[PDB]
Amino acid sequence: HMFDVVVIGGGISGLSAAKLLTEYGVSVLVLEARDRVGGRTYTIRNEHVDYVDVGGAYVGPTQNRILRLSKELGIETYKVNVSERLVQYVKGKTYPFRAAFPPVWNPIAYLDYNNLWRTIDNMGKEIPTDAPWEAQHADKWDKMTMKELIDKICWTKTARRFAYLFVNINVTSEPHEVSALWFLWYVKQCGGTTRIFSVTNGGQERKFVGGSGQVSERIMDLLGDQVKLNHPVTHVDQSSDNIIIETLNHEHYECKYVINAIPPTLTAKIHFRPELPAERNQLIQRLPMGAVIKCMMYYKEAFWKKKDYCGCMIIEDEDAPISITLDDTKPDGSLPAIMGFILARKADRLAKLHKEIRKKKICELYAKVLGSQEALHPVHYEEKNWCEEQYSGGCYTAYFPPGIMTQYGRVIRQPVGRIFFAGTETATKWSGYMEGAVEAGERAAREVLNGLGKVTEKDIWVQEPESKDVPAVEITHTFWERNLPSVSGLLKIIGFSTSVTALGFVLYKYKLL
Ligand SMILES: Cc1cc2nc3c(=O)[nH]c(=O)nc-3n(C[C@H](O)[C@H](O)[C@H](O)COP(=O)(O)OP(=O)(O)OC[C@H]3O[C@@H](n4cnc5c(N)ncnc54)[C@H](O)[C@@H]3O)c2cc1C
Ligand SMILES: COc1ccc2c(c1)[nH]c1c(C)nccc12
Ligand SMILES: CCCCCCCCCCP(C)(C)=O
Numbered sequence: 001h002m003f004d005v006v007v008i009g010g011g012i013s014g015l016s017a018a019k020l021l022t023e024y025g026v027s028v029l030v031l032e033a034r035d036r037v038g039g040r041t042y043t044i045r046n047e048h049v050d051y052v053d054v055g056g057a058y059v060g061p062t063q064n065r066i067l068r069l070s071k072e073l074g075i076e077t078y079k080v081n082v083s084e085r086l087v088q089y090v091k092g093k094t095y096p097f098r099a100a101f102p103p104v105w106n107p108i109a110y111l112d113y114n115n116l117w118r119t120i121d122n123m124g125k126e127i128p129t130d131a132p133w134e135a136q137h138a139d140k141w142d143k144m145t146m147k148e149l150i151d152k153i154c155w156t157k158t159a160r161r162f163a164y165l166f167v168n169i170n171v172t173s174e175p176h177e178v179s180a181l182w183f184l185w186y187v188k189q190c191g192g193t194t195r196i197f198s199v200t201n202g203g204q205e206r207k208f209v210g211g212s213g214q215v216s217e218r219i220m221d222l223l224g225d226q227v228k229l230n231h232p233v234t235h236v237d238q239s240s241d242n243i244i245i246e247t248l249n250h251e252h253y254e255c256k257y258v259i260n261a262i263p264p265t266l267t268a269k270i271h272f273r274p275e276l277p278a279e280r281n282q283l284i285q286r287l288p289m290g291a292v293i294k295c296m297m298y299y300k301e302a303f304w305k306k307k308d309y310c311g312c313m314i315i316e317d318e319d320a321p322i323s324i325t326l327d328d329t330k331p332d333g334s335l336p337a338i339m340g341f342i343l344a345r346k347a348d349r350l351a352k353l354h355k356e357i358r359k360k361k362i363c364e365l366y367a368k369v370l371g372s373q374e375a376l377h378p379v380h381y382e383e384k385n386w387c388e389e390q391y392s393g394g395c396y397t398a399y400f401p402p403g404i405m406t407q408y409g410r411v412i413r414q415p416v417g418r419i420f421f422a423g424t425e426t427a428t429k430w431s432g433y434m435e436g437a438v439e440a441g442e443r444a445a446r447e448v449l450n451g452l453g454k455v456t457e458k459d460i461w462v463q464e465p466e467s468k469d470v471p472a473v474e475i476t477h478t479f480w481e482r483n484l485p486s487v488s489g490l491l492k493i494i495g496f497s498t499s500v501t502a503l504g505f506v507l508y509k510y511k512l513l
């Protein structure tokens, strides 16, 4: 029962740390709470679905780590379907479109919406990726909620409603819940607004053939009996050179280094000895998990396609069960499906229904949105409620409430003696994602390897070579995106246009042109 390293948690972060340590000849024990690995990724297998991700599923350009780890484990990606039209459903109306963002035809709302995404990205620029609390405006921004920033930068109700939604979709909580500072950073560290929100060339570009659960399943395969299921860790005691780990059934393991590869809320439940610094205890108990119910509606035929819909719906409607959807049809066209998310407060309220009613209401929304009755005839329904997962807390990730970042934030990933911290929440690139889980996992392993004297201080943070199979097409903005003014910008200019048109009339009246 003695090891160099014990990794607490066998999600992608944990297994990445363990896989890397193992590569260096270091003995590692992964202790995993559930009867399975993979954590917030979970690929369910049955006859009705073949396979399906009920947890994390999508990968895209710039996520080079999860790509490189996926590949080398023999896992291949395929493209999310966007061949047909995306649709936006607002105010009872279905609006097909083709871009990453629903087109805005009101010229004023257009400016508003343009300036919103530009400002988010621009404000992100300011924020240090590794150290968001060091941002020039950090205290100011960290005190505001994302609702307050949205309402401050958007004049139109259209753009605020979309923004709120955008917040829901990306961090699975309500704008009023999350720090504006943390959110600007969150978006910056995923590559900006276009990158985070897009399918083509964005974070939703791709899925894994056979599911993302296979990432963890196969690292566990490599690890053999150095991974232990059903071992929830409850105590971590680093008083002596041999750190003692205790699991829920009172088994004990000893090691030299611990990697904590679970989200903060669950890190909050571990009895640490000595106690973590008060600062750190506050931070980990103050980062709540977002909320999602992921829902899979199966049909005989991908009827959305024949109406020229790809099956991606941005549903901006407060009565609506679902917020957003993608086609989830298998790469060969078999088992046509719509992956739907119920997010943020809507998840919390829909969780209160029976599954059949939740299914009923979703079919009814699909029927409406897609303008077909075939939606009311599913051959199968899968759902997974992530809030109700004791070993996850929710999905996708933790969110930072206002103030937390500036007050406790600076230690999310700081070692505590010989305890190192991983988990996607400690990542600096695609934190919140399977990508971030790998980054954090490997950097923690490197922090440990560096303790063991096997890796240099410079080598703790390694750059991922860009993926050759899924290269990052650079994100462009049109001349007009760059240069069109905000609503209030329009006004400052119009009041110039007007001033001088006016003096162009006093100069024309007095022949002084
Ligand atoms: C519905 C849903 C949709 C998502 N969408 C995507 C997506 O499309 N693409 C993407 O990249 N990401 C997505 N995410 C987020 C992504 O799944 C996570 O960011 C990533 O899986 C986090 O991995 P981790 O290893 O850091 O954490 P986890 O996967 O949470 O792993 C933690 C591990 O610790 C175990 N554990 C917990 N407590 C203990 C304990 N005390 N002792 C021992 N073990 C413990 C848990 O069982 C788990 O296996 C989604 C997540 C969900 C749930
Ligand atoms: C733009 O349409 C979508 C569809 C699914 C997701 C999306 C946007 N953003 C997501 C995120 C951030 N995670 C999981 C799924 C999606
Ligand atoms: C005085 C107002 C000038 C603003 C003009 C905005 C043009 C709206 C069309 C944008 P689309 C992305 C092609 O739908």
Ligand SMILES: CCCCCCCCCCP(C)(C)=O
Pocket: 478, 479, 480, 481
């Ligand atoms: C002041 C006159 C308005 C000029 C037209 C603005 C719309 C430009 C089309 C949109 P994009 C190509 C994506 O930036």
